[model samples]
Target: SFSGYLKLTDNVYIKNADIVEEAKKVKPTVVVNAANVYLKHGGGVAGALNKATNNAMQVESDDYIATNGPLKVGGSCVLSGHNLAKHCLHVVGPNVNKGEDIQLLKSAYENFNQHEVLLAPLLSAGIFGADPIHSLRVCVDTVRTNVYLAVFDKNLYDKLVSSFL
Candidate 1:
């Protein structure tokens, strides 16, 4: 699903590639993970990244929860990236079917702005069922650092290409 790269704005960009492998290669200081409230990396982008981190990431997240408590919707937390990245930022986005406000989903990306090179996935739209285009546009609007979408689906990539270019 590598659709090359496109700079949407000064900082925001779209880099369609394997999110986990790209993180492993680029070794960004912090790669963003679309995690659930419990910070469980059970499936989707979270699962692949968690597995790639050799479960050490999972251990840290579990420890994070045990110590600090579960993240709220639109809340975010970080973990030391084990193998996938230098550090991982786990973000809990609002689940659409749970009757969550769309604004809550916006906060998930809004809370992150400290990194220079941030690789992010399409948040909340995978299993949580948020509008992917809305999620994409939200990140483009909120993120100030050099953030880009590391998407996997070709259809989405093509749509984004036309939408932006």
Candidate 2:
């Protein structure tokens, strides 16, 4: 559902909807993959992006990881050739199922801010088990400009939009 938007800045905005659907619609300059350490493209958004881009995302992600080493829990890597966007940012967030490290989650967004136009997800709030509110706030605090948060849950999205006000 389209739940309206909150403009974080003149250029940055937040949207409440499915990430994949938002990607198809907005076609952002960078689509951030809330990825794992390996860039394995196993499942979730990473797998979806790989499929959408015809395995090119995975290939580039793998090469980047291979060349630059695996991204740390708070670190990130960038991969181009994504069919949906100019770049795909692969961010390794905390596996909250194992442990919750808010700092790592914060750093993910900070690193992601390097790009101008970005479509970011609520990092570690899915299978990783981080709290949606907490993670979303990290994104709000860390990302600087030209950021669009593609939210999956309407109620949570509403809260997120409210937070900015």
Candidate 3:
């Protein structure tokens, strides 16, 4: 069939450059080695198109900032009450480090779109003295959209996220 593996230790084909054709002609002892070949999604981000978690945490107005001013270097977005279910995929890498908060913001956009529900809240207040609405604008401009969840939670998961207060 067109499935499975083949193992033969010999010159399966002699002198003939068209081994593929020959294999098809008689369904040779060992046909194509599809299993041995590596497969990948190629160009763009792989596995990124997959569905976001069903109960994703929405980006709140306070969670999208760093403890420092506009992160010109390494920084990470705050995941106040996130876990494996409501996780934060920190977008900025250590190299460039210009827009770490935006990374979380854009991810929130993708999560909201895929999940079809407002799973979590987003915030704009950051250590940079950025207002919640303004930070949201930065994210919107960067991601090319104004669509996002506007839930306030400086005390999100009130019993859980207690450090920021």
- Give the top-scoring candidate (TM-score): 1
lDDT of 3 by residue, 42-84 (tens): 2111111111212233223123332233322222332322222
TM-score, model 1 to reference: 0.92
lDDT of each: 0.81, 0.76, 0.25
For candidate 1, the per-residue lDDT at 95 reads 82
| Candidate 3: stretches off by over 4 Å | 1-86, 91-128, 144-147, 153-165
RMSD for all candidates, in order, please. Answer: 2.4, 3.0, 24.3
Best by lDDT: 1
Worst 10 residues of 3 by lDDT: 32-41
Give the per-residue lDDT of model 1 (tens digit) for 47-115: 899889778878888888899988999988878877777788888888887787789877888767867
TM-score of each: 0.92, 0.83, 0.24
- lDDT score for candidate 3 against the true structure: 0.25
